[PDB]
Structure 1
Amino acid sequence: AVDTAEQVYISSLALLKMLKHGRAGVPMEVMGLMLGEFVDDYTVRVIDVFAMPQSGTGVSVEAVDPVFQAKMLDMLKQTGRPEMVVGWYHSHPGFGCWLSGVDINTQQSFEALSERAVAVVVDPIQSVKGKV
């Protein structure tokens, strides 16, 4: 229940993955999870992020396949560098810096799973020239 002026050290390649994934699925509101680790309470660092195809159901916890996520994590461990899951990201063309109801529900599920599981809004269409 302690949340100070926390800061996210996000990575440039995570940004590039975000922008590519959003540019691909502009109208599908594609989903993903922000691969970061709580090195301490508030200095959260994310070095990598992945892109996952939103299932036909839409924004659902099962759309992020558990077996597929586990296999992806094992692949990252074998080649690359392992990294924990304490966050998520989502291209949000509809409206701005808030979450829809289903987004809030799945973020509640992510909070129950993880410790924080930060809710990250990244608008793909509003970011055009200078403001992401």
Structure 2
Amino acid sequence: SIDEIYKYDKKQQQEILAAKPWTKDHHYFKYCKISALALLKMVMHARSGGNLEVMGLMLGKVDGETMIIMDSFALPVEGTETRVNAQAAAYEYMAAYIENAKQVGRLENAIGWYHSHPGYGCWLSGIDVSTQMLNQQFQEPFVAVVIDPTRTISAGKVNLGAFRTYPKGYKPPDEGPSEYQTIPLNKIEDFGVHCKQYYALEVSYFKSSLDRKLLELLWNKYWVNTLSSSSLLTNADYTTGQVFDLSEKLEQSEAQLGRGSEDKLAKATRDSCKTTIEAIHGLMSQVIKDKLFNQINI
């Protein structure tokens, strides 16, 4: 039975809460299972606001080293990324939402907070790290999630991240590859400083029996939306912007060759591909359609 996870054992939670394998090992939690609903609503919350970062709250539970996220919702706050802990404005709508939600079915407890990062990867800024450190300080099992809606679109797949911060004192172990994503230079500094102070979590996605069976029945009529998709005028103001970012990254490495952070043409080359790889992939689905619907004759 797939619905092993949509079950919620409440007494098991409060035994782990008391036991605490997180006060013993600093990097205990390493995995993160994201539900069907949780993914959709978080992606929907990020894009709905769009250009502006907005954060909400996640609900979930713990199991082994996996911090499972079951359900999510929004926090009507402002100044995400510009304020350290911007959720303080609506302390009312955190507890008041879970008090209402527990009457109707959502028994799940506070598991974390998520925010959107439109057009610049998934990572924790210096403002985000100060939020999460103090979140872990008091309100324990709390995981900071990030999603990039504008690139999720252009890249053509779920652009998402799940992170946890380390203590101010103890410093991380060695094993860390960490994959590269284009960071706009305006932000590269902020990232660059506080980037090594935290560690990510291995993301995995699950679903129920009904969800799985519904999505299969849903696909009978959803193939139509795939071949009238067109990721061009949808996210037009990411690709047109990335150019502005790309231009600056070259401008630096050009003068770097001259008189005068290690070969910033190798980054810019990867960015020029990254951004254009998308632009080309876009025109694949376009010609695919011109082939299909236009070329039948009468």
TM over 0.5, yes or no? yes
Name 1:99's counterpart in structure 2: 124
DSSP-derived class of the 1:55 partner: coil
Tell me whether 1:48 sits opposite 2:71 in the alignment.
yes
**Contact 2:119–2:151 (Cα < 8 Å) also in 1:** no
Distance in 1 between residues matched to 2:134 and 2:67, nearest whole Å:
20
Identity of aligned residues (%): 44
DSSP-derived class of the 1:74 partner: helix
Name 1:112's counterpart in structure 2: 137
State the superposition RMSD in angstroms.
Answer: 2.1
Distance in 1 between residues matched to 2:50 and 2:143, nearest whole Å:
22
Name 1:89's counterpart in structure 2: 114
Distance in 2 between residues matched to 1:5 and 1:81, nearest whole Å:
23
Amino acid at match of 2:103: Q
Which has the higher relative contact order, 1 or 2, with Cα contacts under 8 A spaced 6 or more apart? 1
Distance in 2 between residues matched to 1:101 and 1:4, nearest whole Å:
23
Query: Once the 2 structures are TM-superposed, how far is the Cα of residue 2 of structure 1 from its aligned partner?
Result: 4.6
- Structure with a larger share of its residues in helix: 2
**Contact 2:112–2:144 (Cα < 8 Å) also in 1:** yes
* Count of aligned pairs between the two proteins: 130
Flag the structure with larger Rg. 2
Name 1:8's counterpart in structure 2: 32
Query: Once the 2 structures are TM-superposed, how far is the Cα of residue 116 of structure 1 from its aligned partner?
Result: 4.0
Q: Where does 1:17-28 land on structure 2 (aligned, <5 Å)?
A: 17-28=41-52
Aligned pair partner of 1:68 in 79, 83, 93: 93
Change (3 A) 1:74 1:123: same
**Contact 1:86–1:114 (Cα < 8 Å) also in 2:** no
- 1:90-111 deviation per Cα after TM superposition (whole angstroms, max 9, x unaligned): 1112522221111111112211
DSSP-derived class of the 1:24 partner: helix
Change (3 A) 1:112 1:79: same
**Contact 2:57–2:94 (Cα < 8 Å) also in 1:** no
Query: Once the 2 structures are TM-superposed, how far is the Cα of residue 15 of structure 1 from its aligned partner?
Result: 0.8
- Structure 2: tracts of 5 or more residues without a match: 1-24, 160-298
TM-score scaled to structure 2, two decimals?
0.40
**Contact 1:61–1:106 (Cα < 8 Å) also in 2:** no
Q: Where does 1:118-129 land on structure 2 (aligned, <5 Å)?
A: 118-128=143-153, 129=156
TM-score scaled to structure 1, two decimals?
0.84
DSSP-derived class of the 2:59 partner: strand
- Structure 1: tracts of 5 or more residues without a match: none
